Amino acid sequence: DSFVIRGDEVRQIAPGQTGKIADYNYKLPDDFTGCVIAWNSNNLDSK
Amino acid sequence: ASVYAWNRKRISNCVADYSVLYNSASFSTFKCYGVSPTKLNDLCFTNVYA
Numbered sequence: 001d002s003f004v005i006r007g008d009e010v011r012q013i014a015p016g017q018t019g020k021i022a023d024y025n026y027k028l029p030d031d032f033t034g035c036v037i038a039w040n041s042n043n044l045d046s047k
Numbered sequence: 048a049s050v051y052a053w054n055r056k057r058i059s060n061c062v063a064d065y066s067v068l069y070n071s072a073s074f075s076t077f078k079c080y081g082v083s084p085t086k087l088n089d090l091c092f093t094n095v096y097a
Contacts (some may be wrong), residue, residue, distance in 0.1 A: 008072070017077055020070075 001026070004045055017034050058095040064088070 005013075005021060010024045012022040022028075049055040065087040069077060077084060 004041065007040060013038070056097045058097060063095070 003026070009019070009021050011017070012019045013026065013027045013028070014022075015037050017028070017033045066073070066082065069084045069087075082090060
């Protein structure tokens, strides 16, 4: 799953999370067998 | 207030709406211990002390 968010919100991308991304945009299952990989893109996605 | 002489306010006799607080993204932390902040809109109390 590939997407962009504000760095403040990366915390929401985990099992058991709540907040407007964790509910209203991208929801993980609580038994998610996987890895979350993220990095800043202020060199690419800021203009 | 200064932390050596911190303020305390009793909150009482009222309806709370903790989503107003929990949705205020300006808060750099919102750490909870005996509750999940999500449950605060169902759960209720004799008093709250801030």
